[PDB]
Design a protein around this ligand. Structure first.
Ligand SMILES: *[C@@H]1O[C@H](CO)[C@@H](O[C@@H]2O[C@H](CO)[C@@H](O[C@@H]3O[C@H](CO[C@H]4O[C@H](CO)[C@@H](O)[C@H](O)[C@@H]4O)[C@@H](O)[C@H](O[C@H]4O[C@H](CO)[C@@H](O)[C@H](O)[C@@H]4O)[C@@H]3O)[C@H](O)[C@H]2NC(C)=O)[C@H](O)[C@H]1NC(C)=O
Ligand SMILES: *[C@@H]1O[C@H](CO)[C@@H](O[C@@H]2O[C@H](CO)[C@@H](O[C@@H]3O[C@H](CO)[C@@H](O)[C@H](O)[C@@H]3O)[C@H](O)[C@H]2NC(C)=O)[C@H](O)[C@H]1NC(C)=O
Ligand SMILES: *[C@@H]1O[C@H](CO)[C@@H](O[C@@H]2O[C@H](CO)[C@@H](O[C@@H]3O[C@H](CO)[C@@H](O)[C@H](O)[C@@H]3O)[C@H](O)[C@H]2NC(C)=O)[C@H](O)[C@H]1NC(C)=O
Ligand SMILES: *[C@@H]1O[C@H](CO)[C@@H](O[C@@H]2O[C@H](CO)[C@@H](O)[C@H](O)[C@H]2NC(C)=O)[C@H](O)[C@H]1NC(C)=O
Ligand SMILES: *[C@@H]1O[C@H](CO)[C@@H](O[C@@H]2O[C@H](CO)[C@@H](O)[C@H](O)[C@H]2NC(C)=O)[C@H](O)[C@H]1NC(C)=O
Ligand SMILES: *[C@@H]1O[C@H](CO)[C@@H](O[C@@H]2O[C@H](CO)[C@@H](O)[C@H](O)[C@H]2NC(C)=O)[C@H](O)[C@H]1NC(C)=O
Ligand SMILES: *[C@@H]1O[C@H](CO)[C@@H](O[C@@H]2O[C@H](CO)[C@@H](O)[C@H](O)[C@H]2NC(C)=O)[C@H](O)[C@H]1NC(C)=O
Ligand SMILES: *[C@@H]1O[C@H](CO)[C@@H](O[C@@H]2O[C@H](CO)[C@@H](O)[C@H](O)[C@H]2NC(C)=O)[C@H](O)[C@H]1NC(C)=O
Ligand SMILES: *[C@@H]1O[C@H](CO)[C@@H](O)[C@H](O)[C@H]1NC(C)=O
Ligand SMILES: *[C@@H]1O[C@H](CO)[C@@H](O)[C@H](O)[C@H]1NC(C)=O
Ligand SMILES: *[C@@H]1O[C@H](CO)[C@@H](O)[C@H](O)[C@H]1NC(C)=O
Ligand SMILES: *[C@@H]1O[C@H](CO)[C@@H](O)[C@H](O)[C@H]1NC(C)=O
Ligand SMILES: *[C@@H]1O[C@H](CO)[C@@H](O)[C@H](O)[C@H]1NC(C)=O
Ligand SMILES: *[C@@H]1O[C@H](CO)[C@@H](O)[C@H](O)[C@H]1NC(C)=O
Ligand SMILES: *[C@@H]1O[C@H](CO)[C@@H](O)[C@H](O)[C@H]1NC(C)=O
Ligand SMILES: *[C@@H]1O[C@H](CO)[C@@H](O)[C@H](O)[C@H]1NC(C)=O
Ligand SMILES: *[C@@H]1O[C@H](CO)[C@@H](O)[C@H](O)[C@H]1NC(C)=O
Ligand SMILES: *[C@@H]1O[C@H](CO)[C@@H](O)[C@H](O)[C@H]1NC(C)=O
Ligand SMILES: *[C@@H]1O[C@H](CO)[C@@H](O)[C@H](O)[C@H]1NC(C)=O
Ligand SMILES: *[C@@H]1O[C@H](CO)[C@@H](O)[C@H](O)[C@H]1NC(C)=O
Ligand SMILES: *[C@@H]1O[C@H](CO)[C@@H](O)[C@H](O)[C@H]1NC(C)=O
Ligand SMILES: *[C@@H]1O[C@H](CO)[C@@H](O)[C@H](O)[C@H]1NC(C)=O
Ligand SMILES: *[C@@H]1O[C@H](CO)[C@@H](O)[C@H](O)[C@H]1NC(C)=O
Ligand SMILES: *[C@@H]1O[C@H](CO)[C@@H](O)[C@H](O)[C@H]1NC(C)=O
Ligand SMILES: *[C@@H]1O[C@H](CO)[C@@H](O)[C@H](O)[C@H]1NC(C)=O
Ligand SMILES: *[C@@H]1O[C@H](CO)[C@@H](O)[C@H](O)[C@H]1NC(C)=O
Lengths: 300, 134, 95, 127, 113, 122
């Protein structure tokens, strides 16, 4: 029996406000940063226009799964990027050309009551008064996000055949950090259902807002190391955060079926992918001025 | 804080038994959380552990010293919450700890009558076996 | 036959690894932890960043093998280790 | 401007002297080379002045060392002297004239002098 | 010194000879500019001290009598001077850079003898 | 430059020459950081200036750019009075200029005069 004994540390929660601030990275002395301004970056390959900069642009350290809220906008159109094509084990990253503005509200009335009769009234009332603390519903506009989905399936036609249809399902299963969109506003971590958000299939030659429910969990699986944590109870005041959606992370299900109907699911789960989505076109270099070149020259 | 309490009486042990996570429950009971912590409505962590259907959490609470006939504002034992939603094994474990089958709430309903009302005869037969062997 | 000659002043770069200092325009008037980490650990931003564009250049980019992000990942780990502390934290430690 | 910026005007003395005396005294003059706001804001400006003096000195030393005379105050080079540049005796320039009037004489020619020295050093390295 | 790298080998060989000729905020940026300038000067003097071993000290273009294997260049070398730049050429001989420097230093050692 | 020199100072001088060769091949927190940065930059600038002064002195002696340079001044037994076999093994570099501190200036001047004589011979 291998001795795997967990260690836990309990310390009082600060319960403080938390907002991401855009930071920049600069090269130190003796080093430079190269930037590619080509729109068709492709991820891996040559870049035609490379310019040197002394600092990066505005990078917002945001942690979110299956979607990127605060980030840079695509310049010309939508590009997808992947390390390998049809490897079905590496994430596919999408930058949107236009921002999709998403707004989310949480009711702070805490006055929702139901007149229950019969046995179990106390437990029902306890469940209601607990669930009023932990319940949210976010808005997604259908008109703009459907147009961006129509753009991204048009961009996805090129990499996969364009003769067979593609389709979107919800998350496959696993940890709640991956299966639900986990994002924080005001220090409270929100797990948002995205099953109805990716619900439609797409076939070639093709004002209301869809609500998406979000349940609040006090126990999180932290992304730094593997383990569990517990935080402060949520603030009784209302929390509302208004932000774009700039990036999308998708895992493609590999298909051995002869029909070859491609299936795409929201993946995520690695924040290194999220910060690779914003540092995709930048490199750090050093200067080596001394070099050699053979030629037919005699000494003295 | 291990024994932190809000304005509504819920400690972290209540939410730990509610959300179905055994590691936070063990850690809290190791550090010295109240196994019989009661809120404004008289709910114990054994109530939330028994009603949702988490077996090991109920076992960890009972070997830490939780009350088996603990009463809430409405007089409901954890046996009533266990038999409320068709959890047979939680009822069996609570009678193995010694839950009262004759205990009534403020509505005068026993575990027998709410097992009959919910239409789960398999829990009712086990409760009848436990009442016969008392 | 051929002989080796040396040349100086040659514009050749090579990719490498170094520690990169963060830059953030933080005023620290608020008691926000993300703001105070930015004041304590980073400098303010460049007013006039010098942009030099090259006419002819050839460059192979590989951002999946990019190191730059590996340091910034541990930087954000330090950022939320100093910024947010949970009520209870657990990690497995196995012999 | 302390140090290297002081010795940029260090050899400016005896400028009106004899042409033959200054060239001997170059070696001697080169041998003779040796509260909150004050150290945060004021100090970086004198640091800028000192590093500008160092940058100018290394630029001048590199331009001197193009012609194979790195670290040499006085060096002899195999470039022949064209008679169109001076058309005067060697005696009268070193016995009568001064450095300022001589650079006033050869300010027209020193641009092609530097280029012909670079070409002669290139031809020396080629063979 | 990294500028004008778009030119080829034979053009850079000529242009290197052409190359031969709010207070806390301002202080913390000026100090990093000073780090850049001072480490540039220090790197120049360090490279000149390295080049003083090879006998080409202070000279931008130099020539040695150090033998060159045909396996390092693995190319006829006639067309590398007109259409091929420095950046590709440095990546051609990146694996074989230390051994030729070691060849230069001992070659200057019997040049002393 | 000067900071890296001082390590392994008391080792034997024969191995010290070789390790010398392979050496020379080569808001209060923010204010405190900037003031120690500008102190470090002043130290580096004065190190570069002292290196420039000593390199130009070697250029006066004719040894510019050479860390190890051979001269033609004959060694005088009255300067040191030490055997050649054990000086390179059983004596460090630090004790050597402690052993000659009154006599280094006449050696410096006679080396300068020998370089001037060699230049005059051309
Ligand atoms: C992507 O980027 C956008 C843009 O920054 C972010 O959107 C922000 O979201 C946060 C929510 O986390 C919003 O912050 C909220 O502001 C409310 C308004 O009060 C502000 O303004 C007054 C007057 O100027 C100030 O005095 C005050 O301090 C605030 O600055 C607050 O009511 C909110 O909570 C505050 O009050 C409660 C009361 O109990 C306290 O407990 C809290 O600690 C806090 O002090 C909250 O701070 C912010 O306005 C949004 N910016 C906008 C809309 O431009 C997204 O969040 C970001 N994405 C991610 C994932 O972070
Ligand atoms: C990118 O992904 C593709 C798949 O989408 C990879 O191609 C596959 O690579 C594997 C590994 O070499 C191949 O398997 C080999 O198959 C032969 C028989 O064909 C067998 O003898 C070998 O032992 C090995 O198992 C596979 O054939 C190949 N092609 C497919 C699946 O169509 C590719 O390697 C990936 N590239 C990168 C850079 O990740
Ligand atoms: C993606 O969508 C599918 C389809 O809606 C989801 O599957 C559903 O998952 C829930 C549990 O998460 C299932 O409910 C369970 O059903 C069993 C049936 O015996 C019941 O015993 C349980 O008490 C529970 O109610 C539901 O049946 C299932 N639906 C289907 C059609 O399979 C899936 O969860 C979604 N995934 C994500 C990440 O949203
Ligand atoms: C975009 O990047 C991919 C990366 O895989 C390039 O794919 C290459 O495809 C050829 C086809 O045989 C392979 O031999 C190469 O090994 C692949 N990789 C690379 C890095 O070249 C693709 O060509 C790129 N497209 C554009 C327009 O740049
Ligand atoms: C996300 O929302 C979907 C509904 O759009 C949830 O699916 C429901 O799950 C419940 C629980 O078992 C079932 O009773 C319903 O029949 C399901 N409806 C549909 C349309 O499938 C899904 O469970 C939600 N995800 C999470 C993690 O809660
Ligand atoms: C969501 O996207 C919109 C569109 O880009 C953002 O609006 C821009 O905000 C910047 C910052 O002030 C302005 O310079 C632009 O002119 C705005 N553009 C438009 C079209 O309004 C908006 O700020 C984004 N939301 C967040 C929270 O950043
Ligand atoms: C000295 O310089 C003059 C020019 O200032 C040279 O005169 C040139 O001589 C060549 C033939 O030798 C003529 O073709 C040119 O037209 C002349 N003028 C110019 C401006 O080049 C003269 O040859 C030089 N003498 C020496 C010995 O170098
Ligand atoms: C070597 O050192 C000796 C002793 O120091 C020198 O001896 C000189 O002796 C004469 C005798 O008349 C004195 O006038 C000199 O003053 C002495 N010179 C010194 C430096 O003290 C001798 O000249 C030195 N030179 C050599 C290489 O023999
Ligand atoms: C909360 O109360 C306000 C004011 O009474 C009301 O307008 C709003 O609809 C309430 N929210 C909900 C979800 O009923
Ligand atoms: C957005 O969601 C909230 C619930 O959080 C809901 O009250 C509101 O009506 C939604 N907005 C729209 C336009 O449907
Ligand atoms: C929230 O976003 C939806 C997008 O459909 C928009 O209709 C609504 O007006 C927004 N509400 C607020 C308060 O900005
Ligand atoms: C909107 O979505 C539907 C699928 O629900 C699709 O058929 C339609 O083409 C979309 N509209 C666009 C892309 O304009
Ligand atoms: C679709 O696939 C065909 C190959 O069958 C290709 O020629 C074409 O460029 C692709 N894209 C579009 C937009 O037709
Ligand atoms: C999409 O949502 C509708 C909601 O009415 C649901 O009936 C349907 O099963 C979902 N999935 C697909 C593939 O249409
Ligand atoms: C380098 O850029 C210049 C820009 O004027 C161009 O004329 C020249 O042809 C380019 N060199 C190449 C492509 O080799
Ligand atoms: C300046 O000129 C006078 C004129 O007789 C001369 O005596 C003197 O020596 C000159 N000064 C110098 C420094 O040569
Ligand atoms: C130049 O010197 C020679 C020899 O000393 C002499 O004969 C001639 O007259 C002098 N010319 C001039 C212009 O001084
Ligand atoms: C020296 O120069 C002056 C002024 O040009 C002149 O008057 C004098 O005759 C010259 N002396 C000699 C010996 O050439
Ligand atoms: C040198 O150039 C200037 C420029 O105005 C001119 O006046 C002078 O006559 C020129 N001298 C010679 C010797 O060519
Ligand atoms: C090539 O390299 C080998 C060492 O691998 C060396 O012995 C030989 O002299 C070199 N030159 C030639 C022309 O083979
Ligand atoms: C190298 O190029 C020259 C000139 O074209 C040619 O004569 C010679 O045969 C070539 N050598 C090889 C090995 O290709
Ligand atoms: C240099 O060595 C690496 C080591 O694997 C090799 O991959 C690369 O191809 C080599 N470069 C050449 C031979 O130009
Ligand atoms: C110090 O002296 C010991 C004597 O045993 C020797 O082993 C060691 O190598 C010396 N250290 C250095 C740095 O020379
Ligand atoms: C000391 O000097 C003498 C005379 O030069 C020499 O023979 C001897 O080898 C030296 N070394 C020792 C250890 O005696
Ligand atoms: C070195 O000198 C010491 C006295 O300082 C002496 O004891 C030792 O034996 C000597 N060793 C050698 C190698 O001669
Ligand atoms: C060196 O000179 C000083 C100066 O008086 C003297 O004290 C010391 O003894 C001298 N050392 C030797 C070895 O002569």
């Amino acid at each position: 029996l291998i001795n795997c004994n967990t260690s836990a540390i309990t310390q009082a929660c600060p319960k403080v406000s938390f907002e991401p601030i855009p930071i920049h990275y600069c090269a130190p002395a003796g080093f430079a940063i190269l930037k590619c301004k080509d729109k068709k970056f492709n991820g891996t390959g040559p870049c035609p226009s490379v310019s040197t900069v002394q600092c990066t642009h505005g990078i917002k350290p945001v942690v979110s799964t299956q979607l990127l809220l605060n980030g840079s906008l695509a310049e010309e159109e939508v590009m997808i990027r992947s390390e390998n094509i049809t490897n079905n084990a590496k994430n596919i990253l999408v930058q949107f050309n236009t921002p999709v503005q998403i707004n989310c509200t949480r009711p702070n009335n805490n006055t929702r009551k139901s007149i229950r009769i019969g046995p179990g009234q106390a437990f029902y009332a306890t469940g209601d008064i607990i669930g009023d603390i932990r319940q949210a519903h976010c808005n997604v506009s259908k008109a703009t996000w459907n147009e961006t989905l129509g753009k991204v399936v048009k961009q996805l036609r090129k990499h996969f055949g364009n003769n067979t249809i593609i389709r979107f399902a919800n998350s496959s299963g696993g940890d709640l950090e991956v299966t639900t969109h986990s994002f924080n506003c005001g220090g409270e971590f929100f797990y948002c259902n995205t099953s109805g958000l990716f619900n439609s299939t797409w076939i070639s030659n093709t004002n209301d807002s869809i609500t998406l429910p979000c349940r609040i969990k006090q126990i999180i699986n932290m992304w730094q190391r593997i383990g569990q944590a517990m935080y402060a109870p949520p603030i009784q005041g209302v929390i509302r955060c208004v932000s774009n959606i700039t990036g999308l992370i998708l895992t493609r299900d590999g298909g051995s079926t002869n029909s070859t109907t491609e299936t795409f699911r929201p993946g995520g789960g690695d924040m290194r992918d999220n910060w690779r989505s914003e540092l995709y076109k930048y490199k750090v270099v050093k200067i080596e001025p001394l070099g050699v070149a053979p030629t037919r020259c005699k000494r003295r | 804080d291990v024994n932190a309490v809000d304005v509504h009486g819920i400690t972290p042990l209540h939410l730990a038994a509610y959300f179905g996570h055994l590691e936070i429950v063990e850690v809290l009971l190791k550090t010295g959380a109240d196994v019989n912590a009661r809120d404004n409505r008289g709910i114990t962590p054994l109530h939330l552990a028994a009603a949702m259907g988490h077996l090991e959490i109920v076992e960890v609470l009972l070997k830490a010293g939780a009350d088996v006939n603990a009463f809430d504002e409405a007089g409901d034992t954890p046996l009533h919450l266990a038999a409320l939603k068709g959890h047979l094994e939680i009822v069996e474990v609570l009678l193995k700890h010694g839950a009262d089958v004759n205990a009534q709430d403020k509505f005068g309903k026993t575990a027998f009558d709410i097992s009959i009302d919910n239409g789960n005869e398999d829990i009712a037969e086990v409760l009848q076996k436990a009442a016969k062997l008392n | 036959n051929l002989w080796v000659t040396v040349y100086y002043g040659v514009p050749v770069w090579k990719d490498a690894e170094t520690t990169l200092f963060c830059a953030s325009d933080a005023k620290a008037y608020e008691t926000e932890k993300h703001n105070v980490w930015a004041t304590h650990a980073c400098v303010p931003t460049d007013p006039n960043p010098q942009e030099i564009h090259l006419e002819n250049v050839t460059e192979e980019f590989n951002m999946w093998k990019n190191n730059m992000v590996e340091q910034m990942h541990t930087d954000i780990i330090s950022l939320w280790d100093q910024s947010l502390k949970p009520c209870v934290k657990l990690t497995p430690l196995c012999v | 401007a302390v140090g290297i910026g002081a010795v940029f005007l260090g050899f400016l003395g005896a400028a009106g002297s004899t042409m033959g005396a200054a060239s001997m005294t170059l070696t001697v003059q080169a041998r003779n080379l040796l509260h909150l706001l004050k150290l945060t804001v004021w100090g970086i400006k004198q640091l800028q002045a000192r590093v500008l003096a160092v940058e100018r000195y290394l630029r001048d030393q590199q331009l001197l060392g193009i012609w194979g005379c790195s670290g040499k105050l006085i060096c002899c080079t195999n470039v022949p002297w064209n008679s169109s540049w001076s058309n005067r005796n060697l005696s009268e320039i070193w016995d009568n004239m001064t450095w300022l009037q001589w650079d006033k004489e050869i300010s027209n020619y020193t641009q092609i002098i530097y280029g012909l020295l670079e070409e002669s050093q290139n031809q020396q390295e080629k063979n």
